[PDB]
Each structure stands twice: as C-alpha cells, then as structure tokens.
Enzyme design. Structure first.
Site, PDB file in Angstrom:
ATOM      1  N   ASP A  22     -24.140   8.540   4.867  1.00 21.35           N
ATOM      2  CA  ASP A  22     -25.036   7.865   3.939  1.00 21.35           C
ATOM      3  C   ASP A  22     -26.115   7.115   4.698  1.00 21.35           C
ATOM      4  O   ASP A  22     -27.250   6.975   4.215  1.00 21.35           O
ATOM      5  CB  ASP A  22     -24.247   6.905   3.046  1.00 21.35           C
ATOM      6  CG  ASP A  22     -23.242   7.622   2.153  1.00 21.35           C
ATOM      7  OD1 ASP A  22     -22.115   7.912   2.646  1.00 21.35           O
ATOM      8  OD2 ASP A  22     -23.585   7.885   0.964  1.00 21.35           O
ATOM      9  N   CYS A  79     -33.263  18.201   1.046  1.00 22.99           N
ATOM     10  CA  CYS A  79     -32.301  17.107   1.085  1.00 22.99           C
ATOM     11  C   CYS A  79     -32.743  16.311  -0.121  1.00 22.99           C
ATOM     12  O   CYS A  79     -33.004  16.902  -1.169  1.00 22.99           O
ATOM     13  CB  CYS A  79     -32.389  16.345   2.407  1.00 22.99           C
ATOM     14  SG  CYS A  79     -34.103  16.233   2.948  1.00 22.99           S
ATOM     15  N   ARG A 124     -33.713  15.105   6.647  1.00 18.87           N
ATOM     16  CA  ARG A 124     -32.714  16.026   7.163  1.00 18.87           C
ATOM     17  C   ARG A 124     -33.245  17.441   7.143  1.00 18.87           C
ATOM     18  O   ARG A 124     -32.925  18.255   8.006  1.00 18.87           O
ATOM     19  CB  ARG A 124     -31.474  15.907   6.309  1.00 18.87           C
ATOM     20  CG  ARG A 124     -31.051  14.456   6.109  1.00 18.87           C
ATOM     21  CD  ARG A 124     -29.867  14.410   5.233  1.00 18.87           C
ATOM     22  NE  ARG A 124     -29.569  13.045   4.865  1.00 18.87           N
ATOM     23  CZ  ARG A 124     -28.799  12.719   3.841  1.00 18.87           C
ATOM     24  NH1 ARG A 124     -28.282  13.691   3.074  1.00 18.87           N
ATOM     25  NH2 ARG A 124     -28.564  11.426   3.583  1.00 18.87           N
ATOM     26  N   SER A 125     -34.055  17.737   6.142  1.00 23.76           N
ATOM     27  CA  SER A 125     -34.682  19.040   6.036  1.00 23.76           C
ATOM     28  C   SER A 125     -35.518  19.322   7.268  1.00 23.76           C
ATOM     29  O   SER A 125     -35.425  20.401   7.872  1.00 23.76           O
ATOM     30  CB  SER A 125     -35.544  19.054   4.784  1.00 23.76           C
ATOM     31  OG  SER A 125     -34.759  19.173   3.617  1.00 23.76           O
ATOM     32  N   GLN A 144     -37.671  11.531   9.140  1.00 25.24           N
ATOM     33  CA  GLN A 144     -38.057  10.332   8.407  1.00 25.24           C
ATOM     34  C   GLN A 144     -37.942   9.094   9.264  1.00 25.24           C
ATOM     35  O   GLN A 144     -38.523   8.052   8.927  1.00 25.24           O
ATOM     36  CB  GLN A 144     -37.182  10.142   7.156  1.00 25.24           C
ATOM     37  CG  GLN A 144     -37.627  10.908   5.885  1.00 25.24           C
ATOM     38  CD  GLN A 144     -36.507  10.970   4.793  1.00 25.24           C
ATOM     39  OE1 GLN A 144     -35.368  11.417   5.059  1.00 25.24           O
ATOM     40  NE2 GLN A 144     -36.830  10.499   3.575  1.00 25.24           N
TER      41      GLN A 144
END
Length: 282
Positions: free
Chosen positions: A180, A214, A220-221, A261
């Site tokens: 998370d 994601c 994450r992509s 990110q």
C-alpha cells in the site's frame, strides 16, 4: 554501467534529486482532449492525462477519449498502452480499447481496493458463471480460468465483440501484492510477473500493445514498462551496460506523463532492471 550508478545514488541518498531532474526534463505536451469538460468523468485524476499526441482513441464517433497512452519504444520495439484503472463509467471504454487495439494482455498492478479506497472498478468478472456485459461498447467479458499465485494472479478472459461475435482470449496479469505504501522490497516477484507477461506473448508484436494500468497508470505502470523496455534493450544492445534507464524513462515520458510517481519507484525500477538483467543471462 548502471549498477554501480545505483550505489552512487543509494549512498548519497539523492534519489529525490535524480527523480526531480527527470520530472524537470520530462516532456510536456498538450492534453487538450483529456481536459475537455465532456471527458471530465473519463479521468480518474485531474493531474494524470494522456498527451494528445499519444493518446489512444476509441473507435467511437461521439467520444473517442480514453485516458490511455500508447508508449511506443522504437529501439526496444515494444509498445504499451498505459491507462488508468478504469472507472465505473469507463469500464466499457477500457474493454473497447483492449478490443480495438487487439491487445492480448491486460496488466494490472493495483488492487481494486487499496488504502481503504477504490483504486479502480471491478472491470473483469470474478466468477466464470457471472460474465460481464458492457452495453455501451457491446462487449461481453467472461472469466475462463484464473491462476492465483503468491504475488500475482493470471486470468484467462474471453472478450467477445457482441456486434460481430468474434471472441478473443485476453490475459489479465494481476499483480496483487504491491504494498500500500512505497515499493516492494525485492523486485523478484515483479520480475516474475514481468516474465510471466512476456512468456505469454502479450508483449509481442503479433498482438496489439499490452494494456497496463495501476490506479493512475503512471506509477507502477511506468515501472512495469520501464523495466520491460530496459531489459529488452539490454538484450538487444552490444553493450548492455549502455542502457540508461533515466534516458529510457525520459523517452517513455514523451508518451505519457508521470511515469514513475516517486523516487522510490525510480529506485525500484533500477533495482528491477539491475536484478532483471542478472536473471536473463542464466
């Protein structure tokens, strides 16, 4: 070399500085279509929009908009569609895109629920006998099989274009264990995931680009595509160490903003590629 380059940043802690240089160098292109008001409900985050130049267009006449970008990596001869986790109102568009782009694989790097909130719609069927109909886009989606593993699940889906009754087998590669907060500790399972997608032929040019998402489709992509491309380039080039992952990321950011990110994600992409390069050569 990029592994020594890794320690160089780890010891100086300067991942933030690096990552911010990437943000600063990263391309800036218009996302006119994304920001149009009619498409406002087609976007999950105001701050994550596809560039007009690279955006996937739905083969609709009314509104071709989906928050999805074609990342076309010329040297690596890989294409990815990065998209956001579909929204309740865009699940039909997502599958339309899958269909229209002849994608084989959908890669999902998030859970439907994370940190107590919905990160994307439940856009595939969870039980064989409960198929999903997307009436706006006239598609029927059926869960065929599901292989649940420790860090990720692979689903065979059957997507049927109800207008033409063609059906395709879509693979859903669902990485379920991204934490998370932050990033995985070792990239081992992310790489098994990547190699799993690879082994399926979903990244291969005989198919449409893989669809990866994601929640925003950049975090994450980005990490997924960046690692795949970087590894593929290391296999392709006479000098594997010449693969510069910042350079690759910047190239990818010409196609979709925000890819990676955080510095922690950048670090992990380094880890993933560094560790991934090892595995390929044995």
């Amino acid at each position: 070399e990029m592994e020594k380059e890794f320690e160089q940043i780890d010891k100086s802690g300067s991942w933030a500085a690096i990552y911010q240089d990437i943000r600063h160098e990263a391309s800036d292109f218009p996302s006119r279509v994304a920001k149009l008001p009619k498409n406002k409900n087609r976007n999950r985050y105001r701050d994550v929009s596809p560039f007009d130049h690279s955006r996937i267009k739905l083969h609709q006449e009314d509104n071709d908009y989906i928050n999805a970008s074609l990342i076309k990596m010329e040297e690596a001869q890989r294409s990815y569609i990065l998209t956001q986790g579909p929204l309740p109102n865009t699940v039909g568009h997502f599958w339309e895109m899958v269909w229209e782009q002849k994608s084989r694989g959908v890669v999902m790097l998030n859970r439907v629920m994370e940190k107590g909130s919905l990160k994307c719609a439940q856009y595939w069927p969870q039980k064989e006998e409960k198929e999903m109909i997307f009436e706006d886009t006239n598609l029927k989606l059926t869960l065929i099989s599901e292989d649940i593993k420790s860090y990720y699940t692979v689903r065979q889906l059957e997507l049927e274009n109800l207008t033409t009754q063609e059906t395709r087998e879509i693979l859903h590669f669902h990485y379920t264990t991204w934490p998370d907060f932050g990033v995985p500790e070792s990239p081992a399972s992310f790489l098994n995931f990547l190699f799993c997608v690879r082994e399926s032929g979903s990244l291969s040019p005989e198919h449409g680009p893989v669809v990866v998402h994601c929640s925003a489709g950049i975090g994450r992509s980005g990490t997924f595509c960046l690692a795949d491309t970087c590894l593929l380039l290391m296999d392709k080039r006479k000098d594997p160490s010449s693969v510069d992952i910042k350079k690759v990321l910047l190239e990818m950011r010409k196609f979709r903003m925000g890819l990676i990110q955080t510095a922690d994600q950048l670090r992990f992409s380094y880890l993933a590629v560094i560790e991934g390069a090892k595995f390929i050569m044995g």
